[PDB]
Coordinates of C-alpha atoms in Angstrom, one line a residue:
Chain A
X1 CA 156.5 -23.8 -64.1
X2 CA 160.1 -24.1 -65.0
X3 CA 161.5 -26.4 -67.5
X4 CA 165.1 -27.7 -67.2
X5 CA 166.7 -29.2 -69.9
X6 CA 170.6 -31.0 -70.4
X7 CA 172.8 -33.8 -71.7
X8 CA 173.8 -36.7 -69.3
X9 CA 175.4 -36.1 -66.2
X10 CA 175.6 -32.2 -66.9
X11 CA 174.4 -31.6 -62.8
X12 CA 170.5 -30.6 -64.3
X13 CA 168.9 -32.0 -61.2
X14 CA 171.5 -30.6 -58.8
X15 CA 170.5 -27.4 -60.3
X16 CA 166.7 -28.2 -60.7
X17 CA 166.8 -28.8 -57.0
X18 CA 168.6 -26.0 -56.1
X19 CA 165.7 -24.1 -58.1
X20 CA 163.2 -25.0 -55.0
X21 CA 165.9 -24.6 -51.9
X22 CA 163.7 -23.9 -48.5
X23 CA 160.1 -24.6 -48.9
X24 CA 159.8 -27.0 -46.1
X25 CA 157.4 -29.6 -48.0
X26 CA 158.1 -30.6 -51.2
X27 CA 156.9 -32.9 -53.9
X28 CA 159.3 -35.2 -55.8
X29 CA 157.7 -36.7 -59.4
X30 CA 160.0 -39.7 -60.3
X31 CA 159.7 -41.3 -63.9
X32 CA 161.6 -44.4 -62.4
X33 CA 161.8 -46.7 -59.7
X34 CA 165.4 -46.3 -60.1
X35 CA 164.9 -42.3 -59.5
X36 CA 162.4 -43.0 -56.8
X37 CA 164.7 -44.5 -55.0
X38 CA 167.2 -42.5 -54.5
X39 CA 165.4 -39.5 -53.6
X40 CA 164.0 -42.0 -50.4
X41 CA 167.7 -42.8 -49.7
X42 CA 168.7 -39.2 -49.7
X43 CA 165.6 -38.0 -47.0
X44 CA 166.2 -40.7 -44.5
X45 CA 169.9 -39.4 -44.2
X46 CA 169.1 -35.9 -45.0
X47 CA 167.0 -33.8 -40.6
X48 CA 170.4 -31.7 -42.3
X49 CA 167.9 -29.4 -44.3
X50 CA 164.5 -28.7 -42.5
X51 CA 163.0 -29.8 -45.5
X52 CA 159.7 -32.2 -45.4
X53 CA 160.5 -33.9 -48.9
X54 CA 158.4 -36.5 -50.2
X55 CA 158.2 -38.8 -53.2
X56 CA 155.8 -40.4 -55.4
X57 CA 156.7 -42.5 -58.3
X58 CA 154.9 -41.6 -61.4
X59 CA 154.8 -41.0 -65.6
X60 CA 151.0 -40.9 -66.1
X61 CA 147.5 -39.1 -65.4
X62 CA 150.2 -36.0 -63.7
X63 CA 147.0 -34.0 -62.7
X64 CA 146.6 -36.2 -59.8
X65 CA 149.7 -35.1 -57.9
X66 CA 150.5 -31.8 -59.7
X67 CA 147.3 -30.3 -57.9
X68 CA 145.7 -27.5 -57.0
X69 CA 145.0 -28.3 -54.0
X70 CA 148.5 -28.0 -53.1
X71 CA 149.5 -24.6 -51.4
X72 CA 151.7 -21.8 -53.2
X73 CA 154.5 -22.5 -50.5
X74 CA 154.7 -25.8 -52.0
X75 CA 157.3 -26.5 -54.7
X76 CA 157.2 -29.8 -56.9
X77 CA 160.2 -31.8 -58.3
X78 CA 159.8 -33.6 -61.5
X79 CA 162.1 -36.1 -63.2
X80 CA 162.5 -36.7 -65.7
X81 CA 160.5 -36.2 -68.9
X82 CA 162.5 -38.4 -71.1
X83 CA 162.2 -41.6 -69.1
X84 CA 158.2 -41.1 -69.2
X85 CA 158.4 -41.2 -72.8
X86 CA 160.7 -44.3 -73.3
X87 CA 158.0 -45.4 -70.8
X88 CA 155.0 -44.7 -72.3
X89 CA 156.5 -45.8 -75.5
X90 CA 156.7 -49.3 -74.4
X91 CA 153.3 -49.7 -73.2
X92 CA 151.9 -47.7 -75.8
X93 CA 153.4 -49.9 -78.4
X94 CA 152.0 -52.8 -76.3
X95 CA 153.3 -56.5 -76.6
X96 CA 154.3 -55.9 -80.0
X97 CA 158.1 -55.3 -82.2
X98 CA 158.9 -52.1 -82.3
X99 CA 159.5 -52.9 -86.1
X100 CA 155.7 -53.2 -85.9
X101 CA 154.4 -49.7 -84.4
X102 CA 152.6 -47.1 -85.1
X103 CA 155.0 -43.9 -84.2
X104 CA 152.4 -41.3 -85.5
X105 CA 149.4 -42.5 -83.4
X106 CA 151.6 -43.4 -80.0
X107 CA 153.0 -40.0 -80.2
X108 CA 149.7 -38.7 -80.4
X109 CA 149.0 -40.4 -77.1
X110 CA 152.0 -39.6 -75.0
X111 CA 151.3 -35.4 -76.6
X112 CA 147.6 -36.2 -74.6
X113 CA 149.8 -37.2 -71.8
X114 CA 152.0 -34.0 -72.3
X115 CA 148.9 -31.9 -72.5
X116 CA 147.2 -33.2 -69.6
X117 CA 150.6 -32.4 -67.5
X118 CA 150.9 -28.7 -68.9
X119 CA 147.2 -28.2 -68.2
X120 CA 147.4 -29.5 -64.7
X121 CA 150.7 -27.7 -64.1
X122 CA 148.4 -24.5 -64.8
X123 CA 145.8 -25.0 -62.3
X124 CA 148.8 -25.6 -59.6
X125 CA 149.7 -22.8 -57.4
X126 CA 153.0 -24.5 -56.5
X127 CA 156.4 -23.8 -57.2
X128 CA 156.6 -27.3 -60.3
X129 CA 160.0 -27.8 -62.1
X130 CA 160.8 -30.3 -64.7
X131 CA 163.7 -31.8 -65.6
X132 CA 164.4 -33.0 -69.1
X133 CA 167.6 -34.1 -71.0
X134 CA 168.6 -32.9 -74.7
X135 CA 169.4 -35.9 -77.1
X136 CA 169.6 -34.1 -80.2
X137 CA 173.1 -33.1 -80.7
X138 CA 174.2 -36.0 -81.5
X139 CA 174.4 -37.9 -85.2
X140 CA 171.1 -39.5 -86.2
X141 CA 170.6 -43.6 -84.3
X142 CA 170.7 -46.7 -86.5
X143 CA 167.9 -47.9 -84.6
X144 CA 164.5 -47.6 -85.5
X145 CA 163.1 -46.8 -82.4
X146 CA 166.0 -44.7 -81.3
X147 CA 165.5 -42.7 -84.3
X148 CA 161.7 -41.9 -83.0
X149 CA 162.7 -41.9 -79.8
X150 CA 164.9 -38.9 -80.7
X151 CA 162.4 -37.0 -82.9
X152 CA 159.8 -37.5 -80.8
X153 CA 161.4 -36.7 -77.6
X154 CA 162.9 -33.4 -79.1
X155 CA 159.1 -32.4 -80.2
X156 CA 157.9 -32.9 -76.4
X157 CA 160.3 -30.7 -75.4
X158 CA 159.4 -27.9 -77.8
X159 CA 156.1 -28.1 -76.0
X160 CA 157.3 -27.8 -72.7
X161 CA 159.8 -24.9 -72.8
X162 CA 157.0 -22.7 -75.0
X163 CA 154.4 -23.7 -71.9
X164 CA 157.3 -22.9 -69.3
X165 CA 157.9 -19.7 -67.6
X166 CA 161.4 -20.4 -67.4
X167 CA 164.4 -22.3 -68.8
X168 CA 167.2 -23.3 -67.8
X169 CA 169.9 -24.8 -70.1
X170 CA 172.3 -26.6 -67.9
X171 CA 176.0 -27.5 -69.6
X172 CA 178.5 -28.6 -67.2
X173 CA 176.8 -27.5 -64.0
X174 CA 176.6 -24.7 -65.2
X175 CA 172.8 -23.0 -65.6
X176 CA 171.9 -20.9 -68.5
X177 CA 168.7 -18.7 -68.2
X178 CA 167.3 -19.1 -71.6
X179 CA 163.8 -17.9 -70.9
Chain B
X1 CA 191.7 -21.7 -64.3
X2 CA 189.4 -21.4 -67.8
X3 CA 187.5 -24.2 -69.1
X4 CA 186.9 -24.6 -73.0
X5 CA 183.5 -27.2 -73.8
X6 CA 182.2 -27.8 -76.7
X7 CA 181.4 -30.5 -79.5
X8 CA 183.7 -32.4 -82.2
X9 CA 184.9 -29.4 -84.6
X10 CA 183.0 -26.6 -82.7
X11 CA 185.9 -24.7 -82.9
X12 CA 187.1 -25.0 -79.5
X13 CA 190.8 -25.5 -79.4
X14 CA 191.0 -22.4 -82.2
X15 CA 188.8 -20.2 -79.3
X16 CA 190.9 -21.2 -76.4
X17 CA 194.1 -20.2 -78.4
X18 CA 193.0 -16.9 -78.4
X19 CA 192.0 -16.9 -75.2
X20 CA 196.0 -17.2 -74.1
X21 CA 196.4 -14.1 -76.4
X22 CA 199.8 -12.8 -76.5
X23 CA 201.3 -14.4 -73.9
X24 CA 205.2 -14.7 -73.8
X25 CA 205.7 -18.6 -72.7
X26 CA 203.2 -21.2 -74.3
X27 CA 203.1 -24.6 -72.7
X28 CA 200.7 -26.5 -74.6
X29 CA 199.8 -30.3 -72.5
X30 CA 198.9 -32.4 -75.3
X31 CA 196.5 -36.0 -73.6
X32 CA 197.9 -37.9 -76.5
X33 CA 200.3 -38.7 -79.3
X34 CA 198.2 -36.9 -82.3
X35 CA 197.7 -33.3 -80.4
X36 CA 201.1 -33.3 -79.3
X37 CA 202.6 -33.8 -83.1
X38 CA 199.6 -31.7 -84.1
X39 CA 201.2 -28.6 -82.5
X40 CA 204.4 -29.8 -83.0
X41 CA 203.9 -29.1 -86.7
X42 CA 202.0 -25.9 -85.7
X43 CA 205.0 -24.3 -83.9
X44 CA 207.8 -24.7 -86.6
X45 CA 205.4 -22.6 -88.7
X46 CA 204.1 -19.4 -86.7
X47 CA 207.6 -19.8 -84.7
X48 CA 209.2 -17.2 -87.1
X49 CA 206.2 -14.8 -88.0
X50 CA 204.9 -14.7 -83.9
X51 CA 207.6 -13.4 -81.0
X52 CA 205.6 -15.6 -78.3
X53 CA 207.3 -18.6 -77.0
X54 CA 205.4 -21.9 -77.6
X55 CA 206.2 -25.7 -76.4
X56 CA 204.7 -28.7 -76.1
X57 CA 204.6 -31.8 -74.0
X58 CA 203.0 -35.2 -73.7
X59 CA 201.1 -35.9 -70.4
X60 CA 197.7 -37.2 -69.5
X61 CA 199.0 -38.1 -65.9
X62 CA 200.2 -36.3 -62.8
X63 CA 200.0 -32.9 -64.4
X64 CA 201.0 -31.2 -61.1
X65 CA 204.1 -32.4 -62.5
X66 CA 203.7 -29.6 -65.3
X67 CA 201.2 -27.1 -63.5
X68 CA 203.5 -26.2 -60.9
X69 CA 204.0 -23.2 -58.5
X70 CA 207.7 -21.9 -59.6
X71 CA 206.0 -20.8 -63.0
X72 CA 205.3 -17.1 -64.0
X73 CA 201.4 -14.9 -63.7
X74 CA 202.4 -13.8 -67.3
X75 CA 203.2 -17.5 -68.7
X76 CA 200.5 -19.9 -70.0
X77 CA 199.5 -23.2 -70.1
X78 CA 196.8 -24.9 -73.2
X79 CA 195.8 -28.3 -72.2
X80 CA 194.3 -30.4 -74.2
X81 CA 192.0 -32.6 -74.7
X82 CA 190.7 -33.5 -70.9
X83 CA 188.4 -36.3 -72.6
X84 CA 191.2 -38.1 -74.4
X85 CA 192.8 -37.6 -70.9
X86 CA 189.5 -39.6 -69.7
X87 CA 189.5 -42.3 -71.6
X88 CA 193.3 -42.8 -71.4
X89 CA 193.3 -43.7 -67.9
X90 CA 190.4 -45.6 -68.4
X91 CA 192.8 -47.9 -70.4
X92 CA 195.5 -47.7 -68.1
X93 CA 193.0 -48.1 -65.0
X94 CA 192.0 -51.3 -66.9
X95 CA 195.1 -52.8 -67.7
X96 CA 195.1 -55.7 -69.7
X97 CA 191.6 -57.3 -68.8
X98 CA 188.3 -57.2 -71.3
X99 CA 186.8 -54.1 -70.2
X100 CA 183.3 -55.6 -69.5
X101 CA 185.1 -56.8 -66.3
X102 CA 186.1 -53.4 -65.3
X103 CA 184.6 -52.1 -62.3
X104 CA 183.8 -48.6 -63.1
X105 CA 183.0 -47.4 -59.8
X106 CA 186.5 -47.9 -58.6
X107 CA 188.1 -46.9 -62.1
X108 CA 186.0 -43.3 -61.7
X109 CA 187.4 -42.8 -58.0
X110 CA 191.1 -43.1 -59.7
X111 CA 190.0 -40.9 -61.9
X112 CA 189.0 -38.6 -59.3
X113 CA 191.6 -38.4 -58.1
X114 CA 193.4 -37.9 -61.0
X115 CA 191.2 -34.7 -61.5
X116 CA 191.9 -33.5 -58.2
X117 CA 195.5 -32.8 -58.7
X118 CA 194.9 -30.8 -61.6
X119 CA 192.0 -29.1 -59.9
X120 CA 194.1 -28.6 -57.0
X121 CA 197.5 -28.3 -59.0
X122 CA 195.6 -25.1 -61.0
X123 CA 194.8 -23.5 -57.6
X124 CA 198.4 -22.8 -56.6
X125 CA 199.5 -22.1 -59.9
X126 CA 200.4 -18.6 -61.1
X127 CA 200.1 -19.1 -65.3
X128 CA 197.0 -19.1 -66.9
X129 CA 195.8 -22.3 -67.2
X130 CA 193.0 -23.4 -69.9
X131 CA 191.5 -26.5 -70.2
X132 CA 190.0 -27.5 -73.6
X133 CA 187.0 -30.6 -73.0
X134 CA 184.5 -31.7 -75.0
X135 CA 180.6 -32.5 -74.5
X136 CA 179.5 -35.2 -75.3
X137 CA 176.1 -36.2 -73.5
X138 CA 173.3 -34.3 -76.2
X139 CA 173.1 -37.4 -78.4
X140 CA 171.2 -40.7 -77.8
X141 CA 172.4 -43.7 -75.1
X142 CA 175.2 -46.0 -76.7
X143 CA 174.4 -49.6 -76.7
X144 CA 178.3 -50.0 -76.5
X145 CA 179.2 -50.6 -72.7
X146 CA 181.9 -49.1 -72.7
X147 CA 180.8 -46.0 -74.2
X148 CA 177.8 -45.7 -71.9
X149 CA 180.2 -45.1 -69.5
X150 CA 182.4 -42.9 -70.5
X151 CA 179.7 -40.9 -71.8
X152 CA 178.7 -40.8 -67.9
X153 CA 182.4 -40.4 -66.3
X154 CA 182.9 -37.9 -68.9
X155 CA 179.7 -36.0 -67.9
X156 CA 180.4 -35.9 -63.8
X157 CA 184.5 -35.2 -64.9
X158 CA 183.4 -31.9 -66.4
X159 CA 180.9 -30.6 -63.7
X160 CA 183.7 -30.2 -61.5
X161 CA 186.1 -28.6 -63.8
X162 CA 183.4 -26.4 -64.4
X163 CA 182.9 -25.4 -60.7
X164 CA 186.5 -25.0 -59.9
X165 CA 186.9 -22.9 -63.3
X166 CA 186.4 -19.2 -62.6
X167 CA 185.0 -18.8 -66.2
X168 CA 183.6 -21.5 -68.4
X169 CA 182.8 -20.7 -72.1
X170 CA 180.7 -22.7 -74.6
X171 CA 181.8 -23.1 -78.2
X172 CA 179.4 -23.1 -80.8
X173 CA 179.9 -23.7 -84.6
X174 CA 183.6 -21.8 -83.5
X175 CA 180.9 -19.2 -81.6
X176 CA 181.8 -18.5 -78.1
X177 CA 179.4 -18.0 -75.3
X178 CA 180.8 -17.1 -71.4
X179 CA 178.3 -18.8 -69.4
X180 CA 180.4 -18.5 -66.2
Chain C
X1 CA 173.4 -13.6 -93.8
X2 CA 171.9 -15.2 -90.5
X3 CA 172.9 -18.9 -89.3
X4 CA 170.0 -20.8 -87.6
X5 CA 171.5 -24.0 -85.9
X6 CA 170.2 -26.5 -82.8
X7 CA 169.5 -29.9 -83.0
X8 CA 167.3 -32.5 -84.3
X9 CA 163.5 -31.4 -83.6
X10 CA 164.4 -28.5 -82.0
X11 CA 162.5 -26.0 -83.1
X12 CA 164.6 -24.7 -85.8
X13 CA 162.5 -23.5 -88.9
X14 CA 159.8 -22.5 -86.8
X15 CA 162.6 -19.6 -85.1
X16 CA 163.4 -19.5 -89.0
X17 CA 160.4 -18.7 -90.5
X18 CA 159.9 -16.3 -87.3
X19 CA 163.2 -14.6 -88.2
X20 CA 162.1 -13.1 -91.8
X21 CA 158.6 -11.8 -90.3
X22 CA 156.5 -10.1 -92.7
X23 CA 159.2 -10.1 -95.9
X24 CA 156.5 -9.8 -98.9
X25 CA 158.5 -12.4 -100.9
X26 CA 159.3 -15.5 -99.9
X27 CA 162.1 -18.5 -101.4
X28 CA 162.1 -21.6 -99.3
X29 CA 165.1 -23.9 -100.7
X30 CA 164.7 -27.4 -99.8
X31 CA 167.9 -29.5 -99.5
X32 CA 166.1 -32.6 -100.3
X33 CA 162.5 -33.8 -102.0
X34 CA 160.7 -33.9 -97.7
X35 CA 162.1 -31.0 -97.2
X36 CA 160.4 -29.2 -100.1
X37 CA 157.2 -32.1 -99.8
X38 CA 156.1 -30.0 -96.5
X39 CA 157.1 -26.8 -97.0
X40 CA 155.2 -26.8 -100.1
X41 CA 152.3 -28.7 -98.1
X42 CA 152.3 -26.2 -95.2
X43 CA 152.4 -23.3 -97.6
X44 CA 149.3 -24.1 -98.9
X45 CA 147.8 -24.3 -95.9
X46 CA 149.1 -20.9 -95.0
X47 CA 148.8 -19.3 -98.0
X48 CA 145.7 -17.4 -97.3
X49 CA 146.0 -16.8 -93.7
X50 CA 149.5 -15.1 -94.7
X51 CA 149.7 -12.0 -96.9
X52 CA 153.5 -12.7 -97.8
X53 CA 154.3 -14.8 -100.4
X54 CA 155.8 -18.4 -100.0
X55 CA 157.3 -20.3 -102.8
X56 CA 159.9 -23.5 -103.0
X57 CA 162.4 -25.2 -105.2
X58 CA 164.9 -28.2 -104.0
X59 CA 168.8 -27.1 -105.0
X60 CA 171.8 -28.3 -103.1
X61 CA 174.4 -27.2 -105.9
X62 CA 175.3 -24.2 -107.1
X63 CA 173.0 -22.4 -104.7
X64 CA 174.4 -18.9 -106.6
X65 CA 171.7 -19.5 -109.3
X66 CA 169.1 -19.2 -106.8
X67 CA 170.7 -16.6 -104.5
X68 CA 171.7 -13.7 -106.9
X69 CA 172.5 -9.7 -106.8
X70 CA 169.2 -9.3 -108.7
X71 CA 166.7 -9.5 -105.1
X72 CA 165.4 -7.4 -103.1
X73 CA 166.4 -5.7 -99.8
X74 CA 163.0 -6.6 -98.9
X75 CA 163.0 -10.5 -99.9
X76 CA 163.8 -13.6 -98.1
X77 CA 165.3 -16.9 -98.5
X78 CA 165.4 -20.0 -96.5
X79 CA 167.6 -22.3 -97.2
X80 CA 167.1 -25.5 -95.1
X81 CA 168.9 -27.8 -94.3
X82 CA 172.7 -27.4 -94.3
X83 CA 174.0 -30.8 -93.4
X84 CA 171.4 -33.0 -95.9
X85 CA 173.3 -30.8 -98.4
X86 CA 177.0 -32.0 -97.3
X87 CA 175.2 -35.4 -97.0
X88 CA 174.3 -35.3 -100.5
X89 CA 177.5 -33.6 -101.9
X90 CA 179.6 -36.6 -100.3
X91 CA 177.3 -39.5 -101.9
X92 CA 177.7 -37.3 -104.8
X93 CA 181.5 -37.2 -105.1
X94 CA 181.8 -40.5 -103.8
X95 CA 179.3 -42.0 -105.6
X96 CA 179.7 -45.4 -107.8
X97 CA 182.6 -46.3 -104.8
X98 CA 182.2 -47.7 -101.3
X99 CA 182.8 -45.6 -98.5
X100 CA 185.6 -47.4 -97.4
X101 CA 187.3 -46.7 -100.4
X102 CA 186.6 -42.8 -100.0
X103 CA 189.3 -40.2 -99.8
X104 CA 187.3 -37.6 -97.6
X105 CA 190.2 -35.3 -97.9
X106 CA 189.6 -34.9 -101.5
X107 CA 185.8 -34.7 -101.0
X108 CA 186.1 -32.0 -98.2
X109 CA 188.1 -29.7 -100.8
X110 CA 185.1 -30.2 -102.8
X111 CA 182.5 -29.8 -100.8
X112 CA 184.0 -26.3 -98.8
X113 CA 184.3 -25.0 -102.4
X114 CA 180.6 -25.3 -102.7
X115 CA 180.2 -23.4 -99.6
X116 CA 182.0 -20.6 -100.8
X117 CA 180.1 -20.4 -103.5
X118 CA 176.9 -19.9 -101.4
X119 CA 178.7 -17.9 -98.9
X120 CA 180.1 -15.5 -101.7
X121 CA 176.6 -15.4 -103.0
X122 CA 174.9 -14.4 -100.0
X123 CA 177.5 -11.4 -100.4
X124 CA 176.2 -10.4 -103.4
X125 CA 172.3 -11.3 -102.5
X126 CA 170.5 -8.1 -101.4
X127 CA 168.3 -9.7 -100.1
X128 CA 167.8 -11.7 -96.6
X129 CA 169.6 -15.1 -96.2
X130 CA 168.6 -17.1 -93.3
X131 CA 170.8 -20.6 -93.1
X132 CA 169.2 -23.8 -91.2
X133 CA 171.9 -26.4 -90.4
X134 CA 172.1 -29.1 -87.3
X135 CA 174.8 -29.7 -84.6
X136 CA 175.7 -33.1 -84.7
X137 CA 179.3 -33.3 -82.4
X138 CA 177.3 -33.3 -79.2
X139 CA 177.4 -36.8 -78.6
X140 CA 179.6 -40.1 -78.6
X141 CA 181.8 -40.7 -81.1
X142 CA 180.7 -43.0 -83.9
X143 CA 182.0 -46.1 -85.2
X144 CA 180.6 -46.4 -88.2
X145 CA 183.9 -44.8 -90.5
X146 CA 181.4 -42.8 -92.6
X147 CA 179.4 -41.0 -90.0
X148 CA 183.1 -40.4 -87.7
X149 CA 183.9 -38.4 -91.2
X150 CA 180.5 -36.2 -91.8
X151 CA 180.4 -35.0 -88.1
X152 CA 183.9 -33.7 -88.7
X153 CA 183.4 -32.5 -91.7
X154 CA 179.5 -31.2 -90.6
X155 CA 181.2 -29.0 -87.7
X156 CA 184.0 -27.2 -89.9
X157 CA 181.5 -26.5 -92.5
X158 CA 179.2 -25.2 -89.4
X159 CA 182.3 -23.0 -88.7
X160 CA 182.8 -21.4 -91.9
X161 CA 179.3 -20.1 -92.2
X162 CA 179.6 -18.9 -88.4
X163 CA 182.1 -16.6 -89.3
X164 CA 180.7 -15.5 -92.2
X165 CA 177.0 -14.9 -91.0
X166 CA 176.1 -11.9 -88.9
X167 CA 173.9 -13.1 -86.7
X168 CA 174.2 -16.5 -85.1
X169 CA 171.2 -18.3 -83.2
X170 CA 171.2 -21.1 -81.1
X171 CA 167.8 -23.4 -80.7
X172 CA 167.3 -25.8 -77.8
X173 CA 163.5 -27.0 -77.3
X174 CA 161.9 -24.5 -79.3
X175 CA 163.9 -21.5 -77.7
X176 CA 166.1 -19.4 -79.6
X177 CA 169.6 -17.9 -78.3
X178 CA 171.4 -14.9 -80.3
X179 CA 175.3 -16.2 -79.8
X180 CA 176.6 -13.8 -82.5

């Protein structure tokens, strides 16, 4: 599995896609209606590349899609890892004021989350990339949440890259090879 | 051309000097008022000890004007700052309407197109051209509207500088790293 | 000395404390009271299941009284983290005065010539320095006056240890890159 990681707009999927290329059937992961979308949009205008793409939209229990009983010609798409956090952040915090949460226990359930998608990501013989963003460089958010958000977010991502076989640091456009 | 990203006070526009080396003729294409006196000050100091010929000029608009064909392979051009640049014609683009009733979409395409005549006005041009940016997408989401989007604009503006630049280096902490 | 830099969660110390190895004696110096709380805390839970010796103290001041010519080739310090120092020097010279009524010039003079201080000493130290500091210009720029200032002031203090150190690391998501 491949991690890919990068600010906004810096072309990471553009790149993460071009990481899979000509694998006729493909699996696309998206962490949002909104990126659901516009994968579907793209393969209805796309019989341009021979490529049998399909979607799924999805942030939980990965291990259901990201199979084994998928073959090794198979590649899998996922995005993005950020917006399943924010996600499960929400839900995990329940119907309650983010000024009310508990930040050590939800993160302890999203790392389950994390776990479960690094284990099943194992026991796949498909090509699986993920695409992340960096939200670190910046200066430290007023906001509660966003300040959890952030440290939280950058721990998930320490995960990832160390469970990764590769990773890509995208600035620009522009791919880095960092592992 | 050579493009020049990195963060607020990574050093950048002190890497991309050196980059020009010791060229003869130094324009330097300030996007704004500051940069522009900020060199100007520059230049009556290192004008006596350096023999290299250094300039400056204003311009965050039609730079074909300044990039042009009739200039030398040995002559140089330093523009910056391509995000100041950004959110200039963002302004201008808006006019004199509260910029929550901007329609970005449109305001990007002039934008564009403003990017391809620098893109395209780099091609055909014979003096080494570098273009200082900055990033500015690693931090969190800006509850400021406005900021959101430039954030965004700013990102996509830069991904194609980048893949018209035939090298592209990274400035870290003043470090800098070729990644094209 | 080496310069360890990344962002927020990134991975930093752990590259850190993976960059001194097996160095028999250990100084962790904490830039603040959390910093020192878990160092201390995660020492002691290390302490027998790692030969080396680990020891902290908290010092963001006159850093040459813990980093002197009297150490050995063979020990290590780890001085984390650079920017909760500058942080602290500023409300220090600032102090009983709003913000708004800082003269950052004044306090940048300051503050450099306590890096000096700390660079000159790593000089003189024999032993291994290993500096942990944060990138903070990656992102929007900030409204708030005070935080506009320290990001400025945060990457030109990031610069003068760049030059100095002799090794430079990059760390994104728990992955180090040697850029010097």
């Amino acid at each position: 599995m491949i991690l890919v990681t990068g600010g906004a707009r810096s072309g990471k999927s553009r790149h993460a896609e071009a990481l899979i290329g000509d694998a006729p059937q493909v699996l696309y992961i998206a962490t949002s209606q909104i990126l659901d979308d516009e994968m579907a949009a793209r393969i209805q205008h796309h019989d341009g590349r021979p490529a049998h793409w399909r979607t799924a939209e999805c942030w939980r229990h990965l291990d259901t899609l990201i199979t084994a009983d998928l073959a090794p010609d198979d590649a899998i798409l996922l995005e993005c890892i950020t917006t399943m956090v924010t996600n499960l952040l929400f839900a995990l915090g329940g119907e309650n004021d983010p000024e009310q949460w508990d930040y050590a226990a939800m993160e302890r359930a999203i790392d389950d989350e994390i776990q479960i998608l690094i284990a099943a990501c194992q026991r796949c013989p498909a090509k699986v990339v993920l695409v992340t963003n960096e939200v670190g460089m910046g200066i430290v958010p007023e906001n509660r949440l966003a300040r959890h958000f952030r440290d939280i977010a950058g721990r998930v991502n320490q995960r990832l890259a160390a469970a990764a076989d590769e990773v890509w640091l995208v600035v620009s456009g522009i791919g880095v090879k960092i592992k």
